[model samples]
Target: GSSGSSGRKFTEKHEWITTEEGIGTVGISNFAQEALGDVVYCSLPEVGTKLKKQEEFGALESVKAASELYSPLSGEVTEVNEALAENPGLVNKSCYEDGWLIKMTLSDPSELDELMSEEAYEKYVKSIEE
Candidate 1:
């Protein structure tokens, strides 16, 4: 099951987007960290970068493989998880909380309507497991 803030929304690719104060905080899901194994490197987009919905924004390298980080909505990146610059393992240790990846000002709030809710995401995770 997902962890952290209850009201946050999730994407099939395992990115969480919380639309609050006209900005969206993005992060990898717990299931994603689990699948990736142990994270060793993280390449994140710079602040002020603009991205389209579902765009590949960064990469997460782990013992098993390198996973692509995707944008759940179109927006301009306003913030990045600076903590990851020093400790990439934070993505695995606290994925939903302090491990968050990016913050952006959504170009279109309605774009969030297309994302999965916690319940739907829960089922999505189940389907992947089966």
Candidate 2:
């Protein structure tokens, strides 16, 4: 597995999360970015918003459409990618790296086990297509 991104887990909605030091970093997957086209804006919540697993968090706006974002775990938002507000294209350029959406304090670390792993998510995306 990769170093920093080794623990990435995926949701059925194409969102991904990586937990480190009690905080979970959230973002969308490459498959999702590819689907959304170029992102124009990232609508996200404030720093203190509490979120539940599978709850609607924010959205990504693209030329094609606006895609709803979802939380993969229950947590309270600790930070959001301020960079996205000015340059949302980061979401398309590097969905896993500098393109991360938010960071939050996990309410239930156990919920992570329920999400798909890197390999499993790759296969899951393929299953949705040819």
Candidate 3:
């Protein structure tokens, strides 16, 4: 389980980051996918795309609704899950696993401090459930 979601931080926009060796794998939270319902497509950015923290890197389309994906840290996209194009439902079925949206070269791992840790994010998730 060296993949994304092995270690996690979360953004207010419902994105998650799992970083290893200054590389960050990003994805939307399960809570987010559940809300979006039946993901039909993912519009991810290209490798080498420079992104600022919270930047709109792409969008996830589910049930015909579009949800923008934001970066949680400053970085350049290093990889994208291309398999998502053929089976978008991977997002809803495995949002924390193979469905990870992007992997980026974390130019500033310190930026991770700005996102919520797993425990805090779960509390945050619960707060929003009300």
lDDT of 2 by residue, 1-130 (tens): 5434446778888888787788789888888889889888788999999898888888778899888888888878988898888888987778878998999887888867677788888888888876
State the lDDT of candidate 1 residue by residue for 57-128, as single tens digits.
898888899888888888888989889888888877798679988888877877666778887898899998
lDDT of 3 by residue, 36-64 (tens): 88988788888988899878889877775
RMSD (CA, angstroms), candidate 3: 4.8
> Which candidate model has the greater lDDT, 2 or 3?
2
Clashes of each: 0, 0, 0
Candidate 3 clash pair list: none
lDDT, ranked from best to worst: 1, 2, 3
Maximum-lDDT candidate: 1
Error of 3 at 97 (Å): 1.5
Candidate 1 vs 3: which has more lDDT: 1
Please give each candidate's TM-score: 0.90, 0.89, 0.88
Better of 2 and 3 by TM-score: 2
TM-score, candidate 3, is 0.88
